[PDB]
C-alpha cells in the first residue's frame, strides 16, 4: 500500500523451525492396525525406555559419558527383555524361520558385552539413586564437578553401595506415591477412588437444633479409599539383594518399573535439577507461537520438500519485504539518523544481493536459498530471531518441551519413533539431530560414504550410540481411550518396526506399498493382505497427504539407511577401544 507494505511474517505460519503437534488431530477413529506386518512386534515396555533415554539426553551434564552413547539394545539385553509378548517380554526369542529353542542372548552373542551392559545399568541405577538422594549437599557439594557416580564409584570397595540409598528410598517411597502395577490394586470393586471406602456418616443431621441455619456442612462423609502399595514382602523394593546384587535382582518388568519410578522422584525431588529445569524452561520467554508440551522441527513434521517449497515462497516474499523496508518514507527518513546498525547492514547487503539475485535465474531461485543460508541467518535480526528453517538443538526455550525420537506423524495411523542417542552439548560431532540443510549434507557425505567407520568413530563415534530400532506409536487409539473412559491399565500402543539395516530395507519395501495411492479406490497394494499386512488402505482420498508424508519418510529412511548401517558395521569393526593404527597398517601393508 504505502510502499507495498512489508508483508507481515506472521508467526503462526512462519514459525521458527519449531511447530507443534496439538495431540488432537485424530479426533476421528483411526484404531485399525492395518499397518500390521510380520515386521511388527508388541513391546509393552519400550516407551518407558524412551522416557528413560530422553531424560538422560536432557541431563547430559549429570551423566557419565558411558551413559551418553547408550542405546535401546543396551537396555534390552542388559535388562533381559524380549519382544513379542503383549504381556511384558516374550521370554526368549526364537531364531530363524522356525525355532524349537529361543535365542537366549548369552547363547547368541559375546557374553562380556552382556556383562558390560549390565554394569552400565547398575551404574546408571546407582547414579540416579545419588541424584535423588545426594541432595543433602544439594547440587553443589564437596565433589561438585562431573556426574555424581563413576566406574570406580560402582567398582568401589563398599560392596553394598546400594544399601543406604535403598534405605532412604524405602523411607520416602510410601509417601512419594506408587505406580499402578506397584499399587495394592483394589480387590474390592467398591472402594474405587471415585466413591469412598466406608460410610463414615452414620446418618445425615436432618434435625438441626439450629433451624436458623438448615444448611449442613457435614451431609455425608466417608472413610477414604486411597490406593495402597503392596505389602513390604510383596514390595520388591524390600528384597535385600539389591544392596549387594544391585538392580539385577528382580523380574525384568519390575526392574523397568523401579527405573521409571526412580526417574519419577528424581525429577520431582532432585532439587538441583528440579530447579534447574524450571530455570531453563520457565525463564523470561514463551514459545514463539504459543505454549505447548510437544514440538518438533519443521521438516520433521512436514518434510524437506514441502518445507523448502513453502520456505522458498517465504524467502521470495520476505526479500520483497526487505526491499520494501529499506526504501520506505518513514524508514528512509529515520535511516539517515541511523536507527539500527542491522537496519543499515541488512538494507545495504540486501540491496547488493537483490542486484545479484535478480541476476539469479528462476532455476537458480530455488538454489540461492540453500547457497546463501550462511549469510541469510544474520538477516533475521529484526525478523524472527531464529529461522523458520533453523537448528532446534540450540534453544534453551525449546529444550524441555522438545521430543526428538519422534520421527513422523501419519494421519489415521499415528507416530513413528526413532530413539537414536543424545544430541545436547556433547554428542554433537555427527549428531543426526541438526538443521535440515547440514543434516541433509551429512546424509550426502554418507551416501557417497566420504566418511567411514574409522572416520566415523574418530569423530566421537564411541560417544555415538552404535545401534538403533524403529517404532510406531498409536496416538489415535490411546487418546481415544483417554477421552473415552480409560479402558487401559496395561494395554499397549507401541510397536517395533525395524532394529537393523536388513529389517530397515524390508520395511522400506513394505511401506512403499502403503505409499501406493489407492488405485484400488478405482479397483476391479499386494496380495494376501487381509491375512498378514493390510497393504491396501481403505479406498478413499483421505491418505493423499498421508501418503505424501509416507513418501517423504521413505525418502528420510533411505537417507538414514546409509549412515545407520555404517554405524552398524563401525561397531562390529571397532567395538573395542583398540589401537586401530595397526588396523590401518593392515591395509597399507597389502
Amino acid at each position: 500500500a504505502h510502499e507495498q507494505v512489508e508483508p507481515a511474517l506472521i508467526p503462526s505460519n512462519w514459525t521458527s523451525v519449531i511447530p507443534l503437534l496439538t495431540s488432537d488431530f485424530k479426533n476421528q477413529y483411526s484404531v485399525i492396525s492395518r499397518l500390521k506386518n510380520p515386521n511388527m512386534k508388541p513391546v509393552p515396555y519400550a516407551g518407558d525406555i524412551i522416557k528413560l533415554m530422553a531424560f538422560i539426553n536432557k541431563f547430559s551434564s549429570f551423566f557419565h559419558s558411558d551413559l551418553q552413547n547408550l542405546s535401546f539394545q543396551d537396555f534390552e539385553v542388559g535388562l533381559d527383555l524380549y519382544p513379542g509378548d503383549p504381556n511384558g517380554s516374550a521370554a526368549g526369542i526364537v531364531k530363524g524361520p522356525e525355532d524349537t529353542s529361543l535365542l537366549l542372548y548369552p547363547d547368541f552373542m559375546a557374553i562380556k558385552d552382556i556383562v558390560y551392559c549390565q554394569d552400565k545399568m547398575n551404574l546408571l541405577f546407582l547414579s540416579l539413586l545419588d541424584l535423588t538422594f545426594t541432595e543433602n549437599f544439594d547440587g553443589k557439594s564437596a565433589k561438585k564437578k562431573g556426574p555424581l557416580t563413576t566406574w570406580e564409584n560402582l567398582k568401589s570397595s563398599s560392596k553394598k553401595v546400594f544399601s543406604n540409598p535403598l534405605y532412604r528410598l524405602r523411607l520416602v517411597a510410601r509417601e512419594w506415591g506408587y505406580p499402578r502395577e506397584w499399587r495394592q490394586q483394589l480387590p474390592s470393586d467398591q472402594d474405587i477412588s471415585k466413591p469412598k471406602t466406608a460410610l463414615f456418616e452414620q446418618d445425615e443431621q436432618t434435625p438441626v437444633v439450629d433451624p436458623s441455619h438448615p444448611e449442613i456442612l457435614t451431609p455425608n462423609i466417608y472413610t477414604w479409599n486411597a490406593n495402597e502399595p503392596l505389602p513390604l514382602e510383596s514390595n520388591p523394593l524390600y528384597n535385600r539383594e539389591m544392596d549387594k546384587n544391585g538392580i539385577l535382582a528382580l523380574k525384568p518388568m519390575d526392574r523397568v518399573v523401579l527405573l521409571r519410578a526412580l526417574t519419577d522422584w528424581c525429577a520431582s525431588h532432585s532439587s538441583a535439577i528440579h530447579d534447574e529445569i524450571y530455570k531453563l524452561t520457565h525463564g523470561k520467554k514463551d514459545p514463539v507461537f504459543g505454549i505447548q508440551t510437544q514440538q518438533v522441527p519443521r521438516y520433521t513434521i512436514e518434510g524437506v520438500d514441502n518445507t523448502i517449497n513453502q520456505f522458498k515462497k517465504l524467502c521470495s516474499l520476505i526479500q520483497s519485504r526487505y526491499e520494501i523496508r529499506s526504501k520506505k518514507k518513514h524508514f528512509v527518513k529515520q535511516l539517515k539518523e541511523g536507527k539500527k546498525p542491522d537496519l543499515s547492514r541488512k538494507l545495504e547487503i540486501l540491496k547488493e544481493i537483490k542486484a545479484e539475485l535478480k541476476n539469479a535465474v528462476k532455476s537458480e531461485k530455488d538454489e540461492l536459498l540453500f547457497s546463501l543460508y550462511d549469510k541469510w541467518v544474520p538477516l533475521f535480526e529484526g525478523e524472527l530471531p531464529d529461522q523458520p528453517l533453523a537448528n532446534p538443538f540450540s534453544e534453551r526455550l525449546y529444550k524441555l518441551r522438545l521430543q526428538e525420537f519422534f520421527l513422523g506423524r501419519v494421519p489415521h495411523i499415528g507416530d513413528f519413533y526413532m530413539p537414536r542417542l543424545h544430541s545436547y552439548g556433547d554428542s554433537l560431532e555427527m549428531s543426526t539431530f541438526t538443521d535440515l540443510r547440514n543434516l541433509q549434507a551429512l546424509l550426502s557425505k554418507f551416501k557417497n560414504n566420504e566418511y567411514n567407520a574409522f572416520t566415523l568413530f574418530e569423530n566421537d563415534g564411541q560417544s555415538m550410540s552404535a545401534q538403533f530400532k524403529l517404532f510406531y506409536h498409536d496416538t489415535p487409539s490411546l487418546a481415544h481411550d483417554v477421552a473415552r473412559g480409560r479402558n487401559t491399565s496395561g494395554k499397549v500402543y507401541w510397536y517395533e518396526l525395524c532394529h537393523d539395516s536388513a529389517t530397515l530395507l524390508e520395511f522400506l519395501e513394505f511401506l512403499d506399498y502403503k505409499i501406493v495411492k489407492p488405485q484400488d479406490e478405482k479397483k476391479e497394494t499386494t496380495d494376501n493382505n487381509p491375512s498378514i499386512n493390510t497393504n491396501p488402505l481403505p479406498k478413499d482420498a483421505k491418505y493423499n497427504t498421508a501418503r505424501k508424508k509416507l513418501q517423504i519418510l521413505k525418502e528420510f529412511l533411505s537417507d538414514y539407511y546409509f549412515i545407520l548401517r555404517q554405524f552398524e558395521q563401525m561397531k562390529v569393526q571397532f567395538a573395542d577401544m583398540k589401537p586401530g593404527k595397526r588396523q590401518l597398517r593392515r591395509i597399507q601393508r597389502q
Binding site: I114, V115, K159
Partner: protein
C-alpha cells in the same frame, strides 16, 4: 547360562591367610583389591594359552597337561601332575 563376579569369592580372610603364610604381619586395607586384580591377570594369561593348547588339540575339555605346559612355558614349572 551366565556367570559373573566370583572374584569377590576370594575373601579377605583367605587373602590374609596367604599373606600370613608369606610371613607378613600387618596389612593395608587396600591390598585386597590389588591382589585380586593381579591374580586376575595371572589367571587370565595362563588360562588363555592353556585353552590355546586345548583347541589346537581339537578337544572340548581343558586337561591338567595343557595347564602344566602353560605355567612351565611361563617359568613356574609345577611338578606332581605328569
Amino acid at each position: 547360562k551366565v556367570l559373573r563376579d566370583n572374584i569377590q569369592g576370594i575373601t579377605k580372610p583367605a587373602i590374609r591367610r596367604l599373606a600370613r603364610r608369606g610371613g607378613v604381619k600387618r596389612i593395608s586395607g587396600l591390598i585386597y583389591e590389588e591382589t585380586r586384580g593381579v591374580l586376575k591377570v595371572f589367571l587370565e594369561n595362563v588360562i588363555r594359552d592353556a585353552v590355546t593348547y586345548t583347541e589346537h588339540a581339537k578337544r572340548k575339555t581343558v586337561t591338567a597337561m595343557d595347564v602344566v605346559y602353560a605355567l612351565k612355558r611361563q617359568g613356574r614349572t609345577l611338578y606332581g601332575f605328569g
